[PDB]
């Protein structure tokens, strides 16, 4: 198995235990370096949109690694080109956080760690008919990264937790793995409106847990959405799976990978996007 906190099965081991593909040279997360990135004005505003006809329930599970929101099929989509033609279909959203407020994110922005990084996972429905077809195949996946930052003074309604509908209260010490509960749907469009959806890093990388598949189109928004200390401590109430050394769920993030390890056979480039000025 694998873990975050057991040194025998933890992230420094994955390159050996899961060489396909945790030994690769296109791994994630990376440090997102504003100065050492290429501005590409062709990269458009991201849109998240829902199929109005979908009625199926959303669930959340403590999978032992994270809190994972499981979206029904054919419901939530991403557009990178302004057309609402279902090229990318959202599967799930999960989170990475810290034992303490000064770490938790997988990506860094110029070396800075956020307390909470959310990952919206989608498959390239344009090419592949289902998640199970896309998840192991080339170019199959696109993930959105959303940074969260803690503020002392804020109304609930302008926090990310309004979009999350507080996960219907499931974030607590009794939400043990592998428990799943029905929750209110997540308003992913409202979530995206809490930041600038034109301002993002873009690169080709990997899943950040084994098997670290190098088939992820990454988009990481530079502006964070806002949460309170009370909200970040809700995540810290979840218990880790029995694979972990630590009892409480926290520090569920992979260490930083290089954009171009010395052994790369073809360098990748970190791109940045900004709004049409
Ligand atoms: N796509 C994905 C899946 C999972 C796992 Cl393995 C689940 Cl069991 Cl949902 C997780 S996990 N184990 O919830 O952190 C992370 C990702 S990520 N960071 O987007 O690479
Ligand atoms: C929208 O949801 C309906 C009802 O569940 C479904 O039959 C339809 O295929 C969905 N549309 C897309 C584009 O997935
Ligand atoms: C979510 O969290 C706080 C309760 O401590 C509250 O102010 C808010 O009304 C809750 N929202 C919903 C939808 O229950
Ligand atoms: Zn993730």
Author numbering: 24 to 300
Wording from the paper:
On the other hand, SmCA from S. mansoni was strongly affected by clorsulon (K i = 224.7 nM) and AAZ (K i = 42.5 nM), despite the latter being more potent. The benzenesulfonamide scaffold showed the same binding mode with the hydrogen bond between the O atom of the sulfonamide group and Thr231 stabilizing the binding of the inhibitor, as in the case of the complex with hCA I. In addition, this moiety formed a water bridge to Thr232. The second sulfonamide moiety played an important role in the location of the inhibitor; indeed, three hydrogen bonds were observed to Thr232, Tyr27 and Asn86, blocking the scaffold in a hydrophilic pocket inside the active site. Indeed, His200 in hCA I reduces the space available for the clorsulon tail and forces the second sulfonamide moiety (which is bulkier than the amino group) to move towards Gln92 (Gln115 in SmCA). On the other hand, in SmCA this residue is replaced by Thr232 with a less bulky side chain, which makes the active site more accessible, driving the sulfonamide moiety towards a more hydrophilic pocket, with a rotation of 130° with respect to the hCA I complex, and also allowing the formation of interactions with Tyr27 and Asn86 (Tyr7 and Val62 in hCA I). Taken together, these observations could explain the different inhibition potencies of clorsulon against hCA I and SmCA and the 20-fold selectivity for SmCA over hCA I.
